[PDB]
Design a protein around this ligand. Structure first.
Ligand SMILES: NC(=O)c1ccc[n+]([C@@H]2O[C@H](COP(=O)([O-])OP(=O)(O)OC[C@H]3O[C@@H](n4cnc5c(N)ncnc54)[C@H](OP(=O)(O)O)[C@@H]3O)[C@@H](O)[C@H]2O)c1
Ligand SMILES: NC(=O)c1ccc[n+]([C@@H]2O[C@H](COP(=O)([O-])OP(=O)(O)OC[C@H]3O[C@@H](n4cnc5c(N)ncnc54)[C@H](OP(=O)(O)O)[C@@H]3O)[C@@H](O)[C@H]2O)c1
Ligand SMILES: NC(=O)c1ccc[n+]([C@@H]2O[C@H](COP(=O)([O-])OP(=O)(O)OC[C@H]3O[C@@H](n4cnc5c(N)ncnc54)[C@H](OP(=O)(O)O)[C@@H]3O)[C@@H](O)[C@H]2O)c1
Ligand SMILES: NC(=O)c1ccc[n+]([C@@H]2O[C@H](COP(=O)([O-])OP(=O)(O)OC[C@H]3O[C@@H](n4cnc5c(N)ncnc54)[C@H](OP(=O)(O)O)[C@@H]3O)[C@@H](O)[C@H]2O)c1
Ligand SMILES: Nc1nc(N)c2c(-c3ccccc3)c[nH]c2n1
Ligand SMILES: Nc1nc(N)c2c(-c3ccccc3)c[nH]c2n1
Ligand SMILES: Nc1nc(N)c2c(-c3ccccc3)c[nH]c2n1
Ligand SMILES: Nc1nc(N)c2c(-c3ccccc3)c[nH]c2n1
Lengths: 250, 250, 251, 249
């Protein structure tokens, strides 16, 4: 039987590259997405062409709310209904935007989205994944710059910190069940789509290793490692994939 | 005249020792509480008799919800109303209980643990900064064990990790306004009063320095230092007050 | 043409496991050793019988001294003598024993061996490896997942592993413009000491969340070969724990 | 009687401030120096004029060598000889200069950089503990230890070892009531020979006030850590960096 993996925010960019690579490794994949339906199905169709019936999509908002636990359980359920098992969970979906401390979304909504996507949804997904259960593991997409935060990203940053906490807490608690829990922490990877190249270049020039951002595939390479049998004693570890960015002083 | 401090969860144990010491140092104090009304108004009495018109209490639930931003705003407004100023914010209040991955709802457990330990601090910090020869500073009560978490305390631990992230992000963003943001990280201090001799002594025996818990007063002394004029260049620092506990391997 | 790797303290245990895996992946290897000559020659024999002229040994003391930089330079030279190139350096060799702060070997000697093998030799060897330079050059340093929760009375050993973190980070920063990656692999409990009794090993085993056992030398080698591989081309200055959760467990 | 402290490299700059401030708090002090006799003495003079026979000097090279152990034992002895007790040891002395990985002998650089920043603290720590209230050690660390200066691997290794010793010694010595802590400056007093523009470049990086810390600011955290207000604090390293270590590249 082929193992199966859930990847949140898999329609595009890093999530997509993670789904593709998992599929290429022989996983069946649930491609979860929020708004990006067209990209999600194009990915599913592309993947099913390679091997039939190996890819499904699954839509959900991962913003914090009283329906979030149910949403997260349903995501996990969808992998089971589709494939009869859930071997891997990748928590990749993430809201990201500034939330300045001082002077259109309300602050409670910014909390719900930024803390929901980056932390709470990963927690609920992790409970549901675990409640349902070999080489079982969770990979959380963290942030190598978490202790050198961007100006005015406090809620994003709090969310990523919480994710580190979850990574560790869940690694300890789920180890008796045989479920490993790890993280991949990008520094600068794929820059935002419509960011001017001149601004992209300020970021690239920061990276010691080749003055360039990570490809989504290079991020995905670390995830693959973490799910593989070459990482079977690795739990609670966060691998930075950052080109040395996090080592550079101001 | 006298500066003023807000201390959250100041009705008892460690928050109360912080409120007392701050008062003893010259501060007027807002004593925030949730459910501990009798103990709250009792401390305010004790303090005002010692220096009249230097303490009020302020009730608020710090669970996350859409109205939490207003409740936090009101806590800060309460300090200005009573004292015309707000120089010090101490984020001490905290829910703490297990939330295993495998009769409160999960939605409620997330609301309480993450709201009290993380979201409220962030919102308070925001309202504190928005309202602003001075020495303005914020002290967050963190946790020395945040990287060696209690088994099945994931939401609590996520919260405390987010508080680290807040401590750093807000230290960075508020430096240009002369507001310092730091933390104090206890290990084992006053043990939950619901706990037995064997388990209390189990915790005591782990602590290399004197095989005992920290006094509330020992925690408050580090707080007092960080708000003091001897910490004018300190921001974004978290000081463990843990007797070495965090250094001890399993 | 195959790449070549230097693995220090490679005669047995984790270093041998690293050398063997690098060899199976297609590397030619320099098996450095200090006292364990028989085991080293025996390892190179097996590897050469698998593919001729792919394995050599190279003896050196990695204790700190004024000639230690020449000793480290010769190790790297031996890889270039034997194979014409050096693509990978694994800093594995390590002295490990208690040095109580309150109270055999002189303190001087303790400092030299513990700091020398765990930090100073890795620094000097990193120096020679860089100085002596399709390609994928990296360095992997064998660290310790327990550096921040150290064993009682091991201050000099812990000092050295902390310095090795320092080197991993500093060297990753400084050598990135040359294309050389520098990372680390941090065991918790792996192969227990040969002289430790089974009862005490079981005590160590029972602390590990992931399976209540120590890591196999192979599990450690697996993460080394990941970091040297093309699957880790953007990774530098990262230290991967291979500890089964151990560093996460409170007292 | 009043307690005594040893402060290594106390003749100038951050160590002098640490010594003065300990003295003003009521400590008697040993002012260790290597090259700065004249300054060590001036300081001893100035302190003794305030309070008679409360301040002595002590010379030693803290470079790693076969004699380092005895030198460190002597430094601790001088405090017992001068005042009959030794309550505080501040490891402040430190060599600091670049040691590029690609091109003094390197092993002299190892001896100086590692000896000053890690081995001497370790030996003084041993002699301090051996020769035994509110006893504590305060090590001067570096808030930028994880974001190190380019070409300073050896210095950075030493300060990492110092973190290591801070933690190991706090653990091992807690049984004796001996607390072991660190103070980690970011940019404090800039190097005397650094260019004026170079200095302002570093100042500008600092979030809190775009200035360096004064030695006094550094010493303030030292004094806290030795005070009774830190009697449960061990194994802690307090940054005093104005948020410099938080700022991304
Ligand atoms: N790219 C980088 O440089 C970088 C740096 C550090 C860390 N990381 C981390 O690496 C991971 C992948 O990064 P990325 O740049 O590829 O991410 P991204 O493009 O910013 O976001 C990934 C996906 O997250 C989903 N998402 C956003 N808000 C959501 C919501 N409320 N509910 C459900 N899904 C939501 C989106 O789905 P739809 O498109 O379907 O709406 C989106 O495509 C993230 O966790 C990120 O924080 C990235
Ligand atoms: N005790 C330790 O050993 C230890 C160890 C590590 C960290 N800490 C941290 O140090 C701080 C003090 O610890 P502690 O043991 O004194 O705290 P604690 O007694 O568990 O809690 C202190 C106060 O938090 C308030 N609180 C709880 N839930 C709340 C809510 N929903 N809204 C508003 N307030 C709420 C309570 O107020 P009412 O009584 O008024 O309801 C309570 O008095 C905490 O942040 C804690 O995490 C303590
Ligand atoms: N084993 C574990 O549980 C564990 C845990 C944490 C970290 N690690 C790290 O992983 C690495 C491998 O561990 P291990 O247990 O396999 O190592 P080990 O057996 O303790 O040491 C490996 C080799 O170190 C070499 N060595 C010792 N002193 C030397 C000196 N003065 N000069 C040159 N070489 C010297 C020895 O070579 P000869 O035999 O030829 O004399 C020895 O075979 C080490 O860096 C270790 O600290 C291991
Ligand atoms: N200044 C900063 O911005 C900064 C930043 C981060 C960390 N720190 C740390 O804070 C501490 C104080 O800093 P600083 O700038 O005041 O230091 P510094 O002036 O570079 O050096 C302080 C003293 O250390 C002594 N020293 C140097 N080499 C020695 C040797 N081989 N043997 C014995 N003593 C020796 C010297 O004493 P003599 O003059 O008597 O020869 C020198 O005066 C240091 O540990 C430093 O690493 C400082
Ligand atoms: N979800 C999400 N999307 C992102 N684009 C980022 C980035 C990032 C954004 C711009 C420059 C460097 C990094 C950093 N973290 C991110 N998280
Ligand atoms: N709010 C709150 N209350 C607490 N009692 C704690 C503790 C703690 C609880 C039990 C033993 C040792 C520490 C740790 N963190 C805590 N946070
Ligand atoms: N070189 C070397 N050999 C070792 N055996 C170790 C260990 C280790 C030793 C005993 C129990 C757990 C870990 C930890 N670090 C080590 N380094
Ligand atoms: N002993 C010693 N002296 C120093 N001057 C330093 C510095 C430092 C030197 C220049 C700019 C910023 C920091 C950093 N660490 C230092 N240690």
């Amino acid at each position: 039987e082929a193992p199966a993996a859930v990847v949140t925010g898999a329609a595009k960019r890093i999530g997509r590259a993670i789904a593709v690579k998992l599929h290429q490794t022989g996983y069946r994949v649930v491609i979860h997405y929020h708004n990006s339906a067209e990209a999600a199905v194009s990915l599913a169709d592309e993947l099913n062409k390679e091997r039939s019936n190996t890819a499904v999509v699954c839509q959900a908002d991962l913003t914090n709310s009283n329906v979030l636990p149910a949403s997260c359980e349903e995501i996990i359920n969808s992998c089971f209904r589709a494939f009869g098992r859930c071997d891997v969970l990748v928590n990749n979906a993430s809201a990201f935007y500034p939330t300045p401390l001082v002077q259109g979304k309300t602050v409670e909504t910014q909390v719900a989205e930024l803390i929901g996507t980056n932390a709470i949804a990963p927690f609920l997904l992790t409970m549901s994944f675990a409640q349902r259960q070999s080489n079982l593991s969770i990979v959380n997409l963290c942030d190598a710059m978490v202790d050198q935060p961007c100006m005015a990203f406090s809620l994003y940053n709090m969310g990523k910190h919480a994710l580190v906490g979850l990574t560790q807490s869940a690694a300890l608690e789920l180890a008796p069940y045989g479920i490993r829990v790890n993280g991949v922490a990008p520094g600068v990877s794929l820059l935002p789509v419509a960011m001017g190249e001149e601004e992209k270049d300020k970021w690239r020039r920061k990276v010691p290793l080749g003055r360039r951002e990570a490809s989504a595939e290079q991020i995905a390479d670390a995830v693959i490692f973490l799910v593989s049998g070459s990482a079977q004693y690795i739990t609670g570890s966060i691998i930075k994939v950052d080109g040395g960015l996090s080592l550079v002083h101001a």
